[PDB]
Amino acid sequence: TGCVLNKLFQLPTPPLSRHQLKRLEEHRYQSAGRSLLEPLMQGYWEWLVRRVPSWIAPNLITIIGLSINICTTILLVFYCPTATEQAPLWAYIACACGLFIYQSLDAIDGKQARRTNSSSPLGELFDHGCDSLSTVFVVLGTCIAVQLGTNPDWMFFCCFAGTFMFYCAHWQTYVSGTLRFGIIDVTEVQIFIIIMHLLAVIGGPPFWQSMIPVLNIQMKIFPALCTVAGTIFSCTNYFRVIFTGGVGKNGSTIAGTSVLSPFLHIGSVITLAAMIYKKSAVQLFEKHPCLYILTFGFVSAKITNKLVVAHMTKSEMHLHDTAFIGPALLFLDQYFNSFIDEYIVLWIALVFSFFDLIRYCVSVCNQIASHLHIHVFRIK
Amino acid sequence: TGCVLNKLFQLPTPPLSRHQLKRLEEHRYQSAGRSLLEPLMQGYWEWLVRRVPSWIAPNLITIIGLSINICTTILLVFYCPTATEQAPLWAYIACACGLFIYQSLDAIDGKQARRTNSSSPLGELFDHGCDSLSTVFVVLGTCIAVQLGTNPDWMFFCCFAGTFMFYCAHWQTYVSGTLRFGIIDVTEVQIFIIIMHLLAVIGGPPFWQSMIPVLNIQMKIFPALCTVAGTIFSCTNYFRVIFTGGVGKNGSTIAGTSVLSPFLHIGSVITLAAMIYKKSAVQLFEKHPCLYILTFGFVSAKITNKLVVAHMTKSEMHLHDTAFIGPALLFLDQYFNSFIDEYIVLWIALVFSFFDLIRYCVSVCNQIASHLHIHVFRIK
Ligand SMILES: C[N+](C)(C)CCOP(=O)([O-])OP(=O)(O)OC[C@H]1O[C@@H](n2ccc(N)nc2=O)[C@H](O)[C@@H]1O
Ligand SMILES: C[N+](C)(C)CCOP(=O)([O-])OP(=O)(O)OC[C@H]1O[C@@H](n2ccc(N)nc2=O)[C@H](O)[C@@H]1O
Ligand SMILES: [Mg+2]
Ligand SMILES: [Mg+2]
Ligand SMILES: [Mg+2]
Ligand SMILES: [Mg+2]
Numbered sequence: 017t018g019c020v021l022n023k024l025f026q027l028p029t030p031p032l033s034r035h036q037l038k039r040l041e042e043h044r045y046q047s048a049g050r051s052l053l054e055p056l057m058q059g060y061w062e063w064l065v066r067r068v069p070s071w072i073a074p075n076l077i078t079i080i081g082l083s084i085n086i087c088t089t090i091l092l093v094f095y096c097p098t099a100t101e102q103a104p105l106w107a108y109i110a111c112a113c114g115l116f117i118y119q120s121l122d123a124i125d126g127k128q129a130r131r132t133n134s135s136s137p138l139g140e141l142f143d144h145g146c147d148s149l150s151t152v153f154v155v156l157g158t159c160i161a162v163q164l165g166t167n168p169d170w171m172f173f174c175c176f177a178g179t180f181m182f183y184c185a186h187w188q189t190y191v192s193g194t195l196r197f198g199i200i201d202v203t204e205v206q207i208f209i210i211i212m213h214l215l216a217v218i219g220g221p222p223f224w225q226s227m228i229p230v231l232n233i234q235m236k237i238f239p240a241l242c243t244v245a246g247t248i249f250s251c252t253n254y255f256r257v258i259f260t261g262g263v264g265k266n267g268s269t270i271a272g273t274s275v276l277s278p279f280l281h282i283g284s285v286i287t288l289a290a291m292i293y294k295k296s297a298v299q300l301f302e303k304h305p306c307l308y309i310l311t312f313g314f315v316s317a318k319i320t321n322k323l324v325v326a327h328m329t330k331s332e333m334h335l336h337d338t339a340f341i342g343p344a345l346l347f348l349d350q351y352f353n354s355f356i357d358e359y360i361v362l363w364i365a366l367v368f369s370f371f372d373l374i375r376y377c378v379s380v381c382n383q384i385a386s387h388l389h390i391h392v393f394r395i396k
Numbered sequence: 397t398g399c400v401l402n403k404l405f406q407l408p409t410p411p412l413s414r415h416q417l418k419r420l421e422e423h424r425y426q427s428a429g430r431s432l433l434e435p436l437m438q439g440y441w442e443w444l445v446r447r448v449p450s451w452i453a454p455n456l457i458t459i460i461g462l463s464i465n466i467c468t469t470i471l472l473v474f475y476c477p478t479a480t481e482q483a484p485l486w487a488y489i490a491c492a493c494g495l496f497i498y499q500s501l502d503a504i505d506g507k508q509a510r511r512t513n514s515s516s517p518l519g520e521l522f523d524h525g526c527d528s529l530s531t532v533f534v535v536l537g538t539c540i541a542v543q544l545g546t547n548p549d550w551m552f553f554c555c556f557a558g559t560f561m562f563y564c565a566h567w568q569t570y571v572s573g574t575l576r577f578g579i580i581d582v583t584e585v586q587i588f589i590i591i592m593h594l595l596a597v598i599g600g601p602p603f604w605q606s607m608i609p610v611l612n613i614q615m616k617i618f619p620a621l622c623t624v625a626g627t628i629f630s631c632t633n634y635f636r637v638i639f640t641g642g643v644g645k646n647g648s649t650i651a652g653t654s655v656l657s658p659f660l661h662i663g664s665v666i667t668l669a670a671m672i673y674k675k676s677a678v679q680l681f682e683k684h685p686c687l688y689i690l691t692f693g694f695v696s697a698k699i700t701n702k703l704v705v706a707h708m709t710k711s712e713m714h715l716h717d718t719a720f721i722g723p724a725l726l727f728l729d730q731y732f733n734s735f736i737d738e739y740i741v742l743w744i745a746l747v748f749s750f751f752d753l754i755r756y757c758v759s760v761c762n763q764i765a766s767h768l769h770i771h772v773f774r775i776k
Contacts, residue, residue, distance in 0.1 A: 295731065336716040351675065351731055 027379040030320060036329035037387050040137050043328055049197035053204055057123070057336055065124035065131070073395045074129045074139050078146045081121040088114035092160050093306045098366040099165025105217050111157055112213045118150065127156045134395055138249040138384050141328055142392070143184070145377060147202075151182050152313030156306065158209050161216040162224060162236055165305045170240040172293060172301065175309055176286050177247050179316045183282045184254050186320060190327045191259045191269045198253055200246065212239070273332050278323055280335055285316050295350050300358050307362055311346075314369040315339050317377060325380060342369040400720040405495045407629050407759040416684060416709035417767050420517050423708055429577035433584055438501070445504035445511070452521050453775045454509045458526045468494035472540050473686045476482055479545025485597050491537055498530065499586055518764050522772070524566070527582075528700040531562050532693030536686065538589050541596040542604060542616055545685045550620040552673060552681065555689055556666050557627050559696045563662045564634050566700060570658060571649045574643045578633055580626065592619070592696055599641040654713050658703055660715055664684045665696050668723045680738050687742055691726075694749040695719050698756060705760060724748040 032040075068077075088111045095103035125143065155178040164171040186257045190197050215223065224235050235243075264270050269277070293301050301308050313331045317337045326333050337382050342365040385392050412420075450455075468491045475483035498630065505523065509515045535558040546552040569575050604615050613621075644650050649657070669692050673681050681688050698719045705714050723743040729741045765772050 275500070334716075336714075347731075351671070351727075 025100070025375050025378040027375060028381055031325070031331060031376070031380050032383060036331055037384065040328050040384070041388070043137055044195060045140060046136075047195040049195075049259055051197045051203050052199050053207065054197070057203070059200045061120065061123045061127065064120060065127040065158060067123065068128055070132055071395065072128070073391075073393050074132075074134060075126045075142050077125045077128065078122050078142060079393070081118045082146055082150060084114045085118045085150050085153055089157045092157055093310075096160050096163075097306050099160050099163050099171070099302065099305055102221060103160075108161060108213050108217050111161075112210050115146045115154060115157075115206060115210055115213075119203070122147070127193060127269050132239075132395065135343075135392060137328060138388065138389065138390065138392060140323055141384070142381065144324045145321045148182070148317045148324070149314075149373075152179060152309065152317060153207060154206065155179070156309050156313070157255070158212065158239070159309075160306070161213050162239060163221065164240075166234060166304075167236060168293075168305070169303050170237060171305065172289070174240050174243045176289060176312075177243055179283060179313070179320075180282055180286060181247060181250055183277065183278070183316070183320050183323065184251065186323055186327070187259050187282075188254050188273075189277045190323060191275055193256050193270055196253075196257070198250060200250070205246075208242075271330050271332055272324070277333055281319050281323070281333060282316070283345075284335070285312065285319055286341070288312075288347065292343070292346055292350060295359065297354060297391075300356055300362070304359060304362065307366060311369055312343065314366070318369075318373045320378065321373075338372055339369065342366075342372070373384045405537070405755050405758040406762070407755060410412060410757070410763055411760050412709060412763060416711055417764065419710055420708050420764070421768070423458045424518055425515075426573060427575040427577075429575075431577045431583050432579050433473060434577070435585065437583070441500065441503045444500060445507040448504065448508055450512055451775065452508070452775050453771075454505045454512075455522050456773045457501050458510065458522060459773070462526055463496045464494045465498045465533055469537045472537055473690075474688060476540050476543075477686050478683065479540050479543050479551070479685055482601060483540075488541060488597050490594050491541075491565050492590050492597075495534060495537075495590055495593075499583070499669045502527070512775065516768065517708060518761065518768065518769060518770065518772060521704055521764070522761065523564045524704045525701045526630055528562070528704070529694075529753075532559060532588065532689065532697060534589060535559070536593065536689050536693070538619070539689075540686070541593050541611075542558070542619060542776060544616060544620075544680075545602065547699050548615060548673075548682050548685070551685065552669070554620050556669060556692075557669060558625055559631055559693070559700075560662055560666060561627060563658070563696070563700050563703065564631065565656045566703055566707070567662075568581065568637050568641075568701060571638050571655055572643060573650055576633075576637070578630060580630070585626075587661070588622075594628050652708070655714055661699050661703070661713060662696070664715070664720070665692065665699055665723075667719070668692070668727065672723070672726055672730060676738065677734060678738055684739060684742065687746060691742060691746045691749055692723065694753050695723060696707045698749075698753045701753075701757065718752055720748065722746075722752070 025207055082162060088107075092107055092111055093124060095101065126135075126139075129139055136349075152175075154277050159165070159171055159175060162176070167315060223324075226235055228238070258275055262268055262275055264272055267275075269275055319337070322337065323333065324338075325331075345368070346358070346361055346365050349356055381392055390396070415464055465581055468487075470482060472487055472491055475481065475487060502523075506515075506519075509519055532555075535555050537550055539555060544554070565575075574715055606615055608618070616709065619625070641649055642655055644652055647655075699717070702717065702719075705711075724746070726738070726741055726745050729736055729738060759771055770776070
């Protein structure tokens with residue numbers, strides 16, 4: 017049983033050459049900037065991390081974080097799959113508490129890593145690899161909380177903008193070598209999302225359906241308008257640095273590739289999502305919104321994780337990836353006038369994309385761990 | 397003018413690594429077998445090659461062959477673009493003479509190469525690269541001669557079968573290292589095509605429309621039935637050797653790749669041609685058959701030439717190639733319910749595929765020529 021399962025999750029060919037892993041060993045983390053709300057929370061997080069026992073490995077906290085986040089959002093998705101129903105109030109509280117636990121466990125893992133001398137390139141790749149998967153579920157859970165499924169165009173834009181903004185933050189890191197925090201970053205967005213879930217508890221659908229008297233717009237467009245305003249502001253800060261801050265030869269990226277090369281990957285994901293939406297004869301997204309976002313979210317999360325791998329190995333990005341096979345199956349199905357029911361194909365695309373993400377992650381983590389001789393979830 | 401034009405035809409990145417070209421230098425041509433009609437023509441070709449002056453480089457004869465073949469077929473395509481009209485009789489004679497000149501010039505180029513000590517890996521790549529382009533035009537010209545455009549399903553199968561059979565002959569060479577001639581090969585097929593053009597001169601449309609009394613099938617299906625029978629016979633000889641004749645480790649190819657890997661490339665070309673045909677709302681192939689065959693022919697010819705390159709460099713085949721961009725443009729256009737007229741998109745796809753083929757060929761030929769220090773069209 018263990019031999020077949022291990023063979024199922026290992027990639028047939030090693031994803032990294034021997035020279036990139038050695039180059040990965042020479043990598044040294046550099047970050048700059050300070051978020052607006054971060055200095056107040058540091059006192060809380062410094063208290064919390066000191067209570068964690070020293071024998072707990074860093075990557076085990078992260079996986080606990082994801083598991084709490086996945087379970088609470090999947091339960092919320094289970095109760096409200098078209099985003100029009102109302103779930104029991106305690107489910108939103110559980111998601112609210114789960115995200116607060118996630119944020120608290122994320123922010124202390126590197127403090128535990130420092131204190132215990134267990135900082136490693138595996139930890140950095142795993143952390144940012146965990147952040148990439150969590151981001152799709154938090155924005156989806158937000159969309160459920162505001163019942164944005166009744167207005168799909170706003171739902172489509174907001175969910176994919178968050179994934180695109182998160183990828184673009186990592187894109188800046190691929191060119192410049194340094195993680196730069198804005199005034200509004202992950203902490204402010206997540207704090208805004210936890211409070212929003214509590215208003216969804218207090219006011220329900222009548223609050224969200226109430227009219228804002230000054231603007232004559234529905235209240236549901238305000239988080240989306242905040243997403244528009246937030247995207248423009250965040251992109252402006254990020255885009256100045258990609259075009260002017262290239263440290264490679266002749267202002268190229270650190271890998272010597274074109275500064276526009278990561279755009280094509282996330283752009284292809286967003287474009288494919290747009291192609292399937294506007295051509296669907298059965299209104300696929302409107303009938304099954306949560307399942308669709310999860311399918312392309314795993315595709316998007318893997319593409320982000322490949323950029324992290326590309327960052328850590330100082331390598332080029334190949335546009336051709338197996339992650340697009342699942343969306344292509346959906347894309348080919350719509351080409352034949354939906355000869356098979358798209359809902360069945362979407363489940364096939366979901367299951368494939370999930371397993372393909374997990375297979376890549378397990379194979380990369382195991383290969384690096386064997387080379388550096390540490391265990392991923394155990395301290396020696 | 398010369399700097400911009402040279403930049404237009406060179407690929408931005410060198411297609412071959414330094415180690416594959418060195419490995420290409422160690423390649424030694426090996427062939428086995430004898431065709432049925434070849435021993436009688438050898439006496440004629442030995443007479444002809446002795447009359448060619450020794451200062452003519454081999455690759456210049458080949459390019460003369462292609463130019464005569466291209467011009468005569470394009471003139472025939474110019475007169476009969478839907479394959480239903482009748483061209484003037486002298487145009488078929490010119491094509492008949494042109495193919496006879498092609499065959500005669502092809503068969504003597506290696507004899508000239510031997511006699512003059514000018515045999516080189518560039519010559520072998522250029523020769524098989526020239527054969528791959530000529531094959532699409534000869535089968536297309538045959539289809540014009542029999543007016544097969546009135547029956548598109550037979551026209552589609554026969555043209556693509558010839559390209560697939562020719563690729564498969566080279567596929568056997570990629571696994572086994574040796575060119576194996578059958579009893580029915582290029583010589584017998586071309587001799588059958590020259591005689592067929594002369595019957596098209598003698599009998600015209602009434603002969604081709606006459607009923608065969610014993611079978612109750614139209615005469616137009618007989619070359620296609622010969623193509624079916626020929627494909628089955630030829631595939632049977634070829635397919636035994638791919639499955640049992642692998643000389644690599646554990647019966648793999650000489651490059652260590654799966655024996656099924658070349659199938660995916662030519663299969664994708666044939667499948668794409670099939671997708672665009674059956675979904676077209678405007679009956680695109682029936683209105684513009686010659687233009688369609690030329691578009692996918694250049695795609696198919698390049699993919700064959702990449703296999704030749706893959707053979708000569710003992711390298712793996714990458715499925716991702718720029719040659720598919722042109723068909724994909726057509727494929728994406730049909731996905732949006734033909735928002736642009738497919739005829740215009742097909743011209744765009746033709747022009748792109750032609751330039752992309754030429755760009756690849758010029759860049760590869762120039763890179764190898766500079767490394768081995770010979771001139772492609774000039775003997776020192
Ligand atoms: C801004 N925060 C701190 C609130 C959260 C986002 O920040 P993050 O999690 O991307 O990184 P961070 O600022 O916590 O940095 C912690 C650092 O610890 C290291 N790290 C992380 C995870 C892990 N399993 N092992 C590690 O050694 C990495 O070098 C990481 O960069
Ligand atoms: C069976 N024929 C001979 C009628 C035609 C098909 O055969 P082909 O053209 O593939 O090869 P061939 O049997 O003429 O072999 C001629 C050989 O000459 C060499 N050659 C070819 C072309 C060229 N410009 N320079 C060369 O040195 C190659 O090694 C080639 O293999
Ligand atoms: Mg952290
Ligand atoms: Mg983190
Ligand atoms: Mg020859
Ligand atoms: Mg030849």
